[PDB]
Design a protein around this ligand. Structure first.
Ligand SMILES: [Zn+2]
Length: 179
């Protein structure tokens, strides 16, 4: 089968970005999203879904990449939530670091971006360890900004997460052509 590695950014001592409300942590959002994407993709027998973390545990960047490399993942998707010094910043972004990951970023963004319904900030280059050191198509998704009051609430909305999780799942399913 085709192996899909889903990486929920941060975890444990690393809370990631703290929402403007000061009541939500990015790590919480990342895990909830990863678990939802896993549940959706698990229904596909042509896929073998592996999560770098399935609970609130700490994982070094090198460790997340090692799993993907060791299990020979076909794709790698790191899920994150963004933060800005200005509470006005908002939108969804998809990052790639290597040329071989651009096709996947394009397909992923095609289904992922519309699902968030947030401002489409497009596909951008990002020098992030997990998408740089990986050798298979790898993208990092910054779903939305936790620094924006309305957007933070939206990212922690159950329906939003389910819709976006399906979009992320579609990006993977479509790219791997396992419909
Ligand atoms: Zn992050």
């Amino acid at each position: 089968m085709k192996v899909v590695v889903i990486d929920a950014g941060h975890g444990a001592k690393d809370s990631g970005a703290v929402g403007i409300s000061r009541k939500n942590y990015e790590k919480t959002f990342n895990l909830a999203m990863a678990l939802k994407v896993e549940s959706i993709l698990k229904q596909n027998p042509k896929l073998e879904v592996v999560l770098t973390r399935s609970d609130d545990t700490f994982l070094e960047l090198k460790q997340r990449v090692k799993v993907a490399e060791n299990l020979k993942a076909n794709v790698f998707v790191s899920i994150h939530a963004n933060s800005s010094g200005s509470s006005a910043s908002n939108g969804t972004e998809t990052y790639y670091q290597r040329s071989a990951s651009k096709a996947f970023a394009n397909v992923m963004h095609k289904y992922f971006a519309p699902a968030t319904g947030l401002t489409d900030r497009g596909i951008r280059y990002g020098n992030f360890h997990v998408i740089r050191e990986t050798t298979m198509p790898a993208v990092l998704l910054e779903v939305g900004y936790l620094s924006n009051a309305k957007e933070e609430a939206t990212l922690f909305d159950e329906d939003f997460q389910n819709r976006v999780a399906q979009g992320i799942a579609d990006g993977i399913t479509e790219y791997l052509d396992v419909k």
